């Protein structure tokens, strides 16, 4: 008798945990990729303007 009731209570929380975390994870990183990506991009456009002033002045 006792096995199945405790077995279900474990197995359910097992599937519950991953999936609320899986929810959060997909959102957050992916929003966190976006603005990441666009760092990296905009990083260079100023350098090049920046660096250019030095290069042309030389």
């Amino acid at each position: 008798q006792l096995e199945e009731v405790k077995q279900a209570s474990i197995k359910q929380i097992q599937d519950a945990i991953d999936m609320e975390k899986s929810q959060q994870a997909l959102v957050q990183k992916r929003h966190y990729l976006f603005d990441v990506q666009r760092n990296n991009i905009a990083m260079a456009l100023e350098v090049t303007y920046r660096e250019r002033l030095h290069r042309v002045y030389r």
Partner: protein
């Protein structure tokens, strides 16, 4: 000459003659000129070859966001 300023004169009128030649002072002559020609050229070697009497203009571009 040693009313000492006369030795400045001694030099100076030969500056006066030389500067009151052409190029201002010349008589340095072609031998000077080959010497010039090298270092004036040699300068360009360090230094690039174009608008040393006009303004250089430039260009602005990108490869990719690698």
């Amino acid at each position: 000459l040693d009313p000492v300023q006369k030795l400045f004169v001694d030099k100076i009128r030969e500056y006066r003659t030389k500067r009151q030649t052409s190029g201002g002072p010349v008589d340095a002559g072609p031998e000077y000129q080959q010497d010039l020609d090298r270092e004036l050229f040699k300068l360009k070697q360090m230094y690039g070859k174009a608008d040393m009497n006009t303004f250089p203009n430039f260009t602005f571009e990108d490869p990719k966001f690698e």
